[PDB]
Amino acid sequence: SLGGQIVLGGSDPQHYEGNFHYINLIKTGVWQIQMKGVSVGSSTLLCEDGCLALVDTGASYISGSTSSIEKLMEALGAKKRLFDYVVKCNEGPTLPDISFHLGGKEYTLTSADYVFQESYSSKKLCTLAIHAMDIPPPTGPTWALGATFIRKFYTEFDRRNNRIGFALARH
Amino acid sequence: GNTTSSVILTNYMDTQYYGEIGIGTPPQTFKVVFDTGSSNVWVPSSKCSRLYTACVYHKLFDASDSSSYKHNGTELTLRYSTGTVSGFLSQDIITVGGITVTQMFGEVTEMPALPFMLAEFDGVVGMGFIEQAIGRVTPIFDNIISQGVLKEDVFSFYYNRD
Ligand SMILES: Cc1cc(Cl)c(OCCOc2ccc([C@H]3CCNC[C@@H]3C(=O)N(Cc3cc(CNC4CC4)ccc3Cl)C3CC3)cn2)c(Cl)c1
Ligand SMILES: *[C@@H]1O[C@H](CO)[C@@H](O)[C@H](O)[C@H]1NC(C)=O
Numbered sequence: 118s119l120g121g122q123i124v125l126g127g128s129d130p131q132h133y134e135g136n137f138h139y140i141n142l143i144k145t146g147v148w149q150i151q152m153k154g155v156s157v158g159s160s161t162l163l164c165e166d167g168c169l170a171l172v173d174t175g176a177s178y179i180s181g182s183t184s185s186i187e188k189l190m191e192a193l194g195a196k197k198r199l200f201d202y203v204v205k206c207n208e209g210p211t212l213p214d215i216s217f218h219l220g221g222k223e224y225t226l227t228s229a230d231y232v233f234q235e236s237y238s239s240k241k242l243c244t245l246a247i248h249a250m251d252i253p254p255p256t257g258p259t260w261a262l263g264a265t266f267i268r269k270f271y272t273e274f275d276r277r278n279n280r281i282g283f284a285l286a287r288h
Numbered sequence: 289g290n291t292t293s294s295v296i297l298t299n300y301m302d303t304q305y306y307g308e309i310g311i312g313t314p315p316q317t318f319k320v321v322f323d324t325g326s327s328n329v330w331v332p333s334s335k336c337s338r339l340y341t342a343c344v345y346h347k348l349f350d351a352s353d354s355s356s357y358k359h360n361g362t363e364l365t366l367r368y369s370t371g372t373v374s375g376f377l378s379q380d381i382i383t384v385g386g387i388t389v390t391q392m393f394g395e396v397t398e399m400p401a402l403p404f405m406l407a408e409f410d411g412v413v414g415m416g417f418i419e420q421a422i423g424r425v426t427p428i429f430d431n432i433i434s435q436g437v438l439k440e441d442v443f444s445f446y447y448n449r450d
Contacts, residue, residue: 120299146419175323
């Protein structure tokens with residue numbers, strides 16, 4: 118299996134579909150862009166007045182501030198463990214889509230995109246690929262879009278134009 | 289100035305994505321996460337005591353085996369939540385895919401056991417900006433840009449599912 122790929126000096130069309138959509142960086146110096154909302158299902162629960170998103174390839178998960186994630190998870194029925202949030206494995210496949218409003222587009226993750234479905238049993242707990250992390254100034258407070266996001270959306274980091282481009286990953 | 293260069297990544301458990309770089313002459317190979325959330329190159333140093341758990345199961349860079357290594361020694365420190373990561377600056381030739389670049393990087397002499405002992409890779413290649421670089425060390429992608437070998441001043445990530 119091909120675990121992943123980084124291209125320097127371009128992109129690889131055999132691994133994404135359609136065309137890139139681009140968002141300008143807020144300020145040069147960091148791979149961070151403006152976010153205009155996070156929808157659970159079809160309602161904008163969070164970041165309703167805009168917030169920041171770090172596109173962080175060295176992070177495993179999607180992260181938000183403790184307050185934002187408490188709220189995200191409250192809406193998902195997920196239970197706070199020490200480190201992570203969990204759901205009863207049987208409800209995993211029924212978890213709502215989650216959307217990130219970036220540029221002109223919604224970037225939608227379904228339950229298969231963020232639930233570690235290690236079982237389908239009600240006696241078992243399944244982890245979520247979303248965690249709380251308080252990133253301190255100057256970078257944060259911010260969301261971080263890690264591997265959970267990048268898996269679904271092929272990402273281009275563009276230094277010439279100071280932008281980040283997203284296209285649908287082809288698996 | 290017409291090259292694209294790719295690096296195959298390994299997916300560990302949907303949480304760690306890493307590929308190979310080479311440091312020195314001859315190349316000492318290391319598995320590294322290519323990290324847009326940091327701007328430094330870090331690898332463990334042969335000078336990291338075996339009494340650090342994070343250093344005992346990872347590849348260690350040995351300057352005394354590299355003919356192209358240029359000593360620097362500036363102590364540098366990264367502040368992590370679980371403790372401090374510290375080491376010193378060295379320069380050597382770093383190969384990434386088909387690309388060779390002379391680069392300043394940190395050799396790590398101490399780091400918290402956690403999360404570092406849980407990494408399946410040995411170091412990190414920061415792909416962020418000089419602004420966030422510890423010691424304002426020129427980031428690797430800036431040294432690649434300066435070479436003028438790339439088709440475009442961009443890099444892209446594909447991450448598969450496991
Ligand atoms: C063995 C080993 C590992 C490393 Cl990083 C290393 O370099 C020391 C440099 O230290 C660090 C530590 C953290 C960071 C974070 C900065 C922003 N992105 C996530 C990074 C992140 O969390 N990780 C660390 C990390 C991430 C994950 C993935 N999961 C966490 C949710 C991110 C798992 C383990 C580790 Cl240790 C950086 C990017 C690799 C950068 N550099 C050396 Cl010298 C030796
Ligand atoms: C290490 O390199 C940096 C270059 O930015 C320099 O500031 C520092 O003086 C160097 N240390 C040495 C070799 O004295």
